[PDB]
Symmetry: D2
Subunit: 216 residues, 4 copies
């Protein structure tokens, strides 16, 4: 046993902090990326150097269109974890021009987590009982407006809403396989949300599912 | 003054009833369709015959991909109403194979209403003060599971959630232009929801916005 | 065989409107008051003037405090309808140092419990009526008032009270649904409101229950 | 300068766990009881056994009913911490014919108001402390119990009570945020729970407030 965490958007502002923090706790991290390959590798450099083969970068396109389906690209991201360490215990989902753009950011921000969670669960489902880890938890992040800046009020509230239903609904559907699913949002530092994430992923939080954490 | 209602999915089971009912009340209806052109025209036949030039069918593709954006296809649907009657007072939003499908049904069911509402409001915004109608209301329908049958529990709950936030958020954002926005869902006949829709669209409901109606 | 409506706090302001509006639709009205005799009798006379035997005033303390229990007082008020007219089809619940604090407690409990008990009695009376002898459209409306119109309450205790009342509405809807009794609420958005009341009570709302209507 | 925690209903079952758990983290604990003297003294002795001057029992009636007002009783219980230890940093609120009905009313008001008043007093004490002299981590936890563990309540009145309590949590969080006092809730999903309490009270939750944690 050494547990494994997949942090999507792992080189972004938040994701990195979550990643540093899950790694400090003794998790092996998969550091997901699209655009930011260099920073992925810096981060992987820093952690592996601190503790060897404890981190991998992995590129994945989390957009609405990459013809390869998002459903499949998502399943492949989770697969990177199994190929490389053979388990995945933790998932953290972190003008016409403008309009089509906002609609697409809406789609992947709801649909990527959905498919990343189908995938995560499918694998746990397939792992045999004896060889399953003991503490599977999924955290959906939701963000302030400042961090979804290319936004009007309304679209943001739609995305929060679906994310909100993802969390409560999977919490339920996925309890038979012992998978907790929780959320962290604002609120009506990076170091800060990280402690929440660490607690929800910790053994302390075994009986906690369905819960939308609020922060500041 | 004779008010105008746009009922998307207007030949489907529910939509038709809503349409017959808004028309009985004295609304001129635009009967939206994609696949079901024949039934659109039967319905238009029945109402115009009952009361002349009081109904038009209009085809629109409400899918996620029809390269023409949904944003634009939506704006064009609302435009059909203005071209033909010069006003629009009422909007009613009514295997990899399987997965991409569900993701797409998710996208258009959240995003079509969003863009149908941007469009509706834009026009009202552009109409001059003197020539605006007096009672603009928008109703978002949400449906039982039986009517979104190609579904798992979770996806359905995501869509409800975004729809839910659309309704509350626009209610707010769109109150300066006097546009009420409300929802009708189940519940935790066709004739039945129709009366709710008629009331929310009626002058009786002037001070009602933000409200999610529940039914049975 | 003319429907009967029980409006608590009929004597002054929102109560009167609602009673007046309901009366103008042809219910017989029972106008509860506590301290405002002039107002309840004046109003009842006016109404009885317009249509004979159509209104009565009925006195009750609905504060929270045998010396008579709140339950019994609430049961007798509901009984004053049967006695007088044979039936009761509609209930509208209008909410109305160390010293401020105990009074703010008393108020809180009074606003939650009086409706709770009223709803209990109403419903027990329905259940005692032989099956074939019941009315065809039982509905209950819980009014929530703006923070600004009940000045003795801090933000917190107000929210508490709003929370108790939403619970009762949603709870009682589910719990009474077998007796075909609908329970709904009118509250402020984020005779104005009498039309919503008329609607919820109307035969057109036969399937609306457990709804919190938002009015501003 | 050792932190002090006030647990209502410490005497039996969930209360004891929580007090025990909090105590095992090194708070000084004030163990409220009403009727169960044996339980509160036994437990306090055990704890004081393990570490001297680390626990005391303190008696209070927290029912809803000068003859002493609930407010004053709640103020004095909170005062029994200052008096004894100089400070109070953590509050945990554990909820615990015609006749059943009046008792079910009394219970309801007691469960909403006792916490409300407790939170008032706690917070007044914080505010009277000169600025530079306050503790660094004030937190409040409102426990909600399962329907099954408080048998005297119908579904409806329970939901009412749950609603009052969620209101207080979310309300008091916003209202006390200027005094750097956090308010959160633990409730059932749709020493198990002591770890969540420890967490919410811990320095790692400095930015968590207004959260309803869901535990089953």
């Amino acid at each position: 046993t050494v547990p494994v965490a997949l942090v999507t958007g792992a080189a972004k502002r938040l994701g990195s902090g979550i990643a540093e923090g899950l790694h400090a706790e003794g998790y092996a991290v998969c550091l997901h990326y699209h655009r930011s390959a260099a920073e992925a590798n810096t981060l992987a450099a820093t952690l592996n150097a601190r503790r060897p083969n404890s981190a991998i970068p992995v590129q994945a396109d989390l957009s609405n269109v990459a013809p390869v389906t998002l459903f499949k690209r998502c399943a492949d991201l989770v697969a990177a974890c199994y190929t490389h360490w053979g388990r995945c215990d933790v998932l953290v989902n972190n003008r016409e021009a403008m309009e089509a753009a906002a609609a697409d950011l809406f789609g992947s921000n709801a649909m990527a987590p959905y498919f990343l969670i189908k995938a995560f669960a499918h694998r746990v489902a397939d792992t045999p009982a004896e060889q399953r880890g003991t503490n599977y938890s999924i955290v959906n992040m939701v963000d302030a407006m400042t961090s979804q800046p290319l936004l009007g009020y309304t679209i943001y509230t739609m995305a929060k809403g679906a994310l909100e239903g993802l969390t409560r609904s999977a919490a339920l559907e996925l309890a038979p396989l012992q998978i907790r699913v929780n959320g962290v949002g604002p609120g009506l530092s990076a170091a800060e949300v990280s402690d929440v994430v660490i607690f929800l992923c910790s053994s302390k939080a075994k009986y906690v599912t369905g819960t939308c954490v609020k922060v500041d």
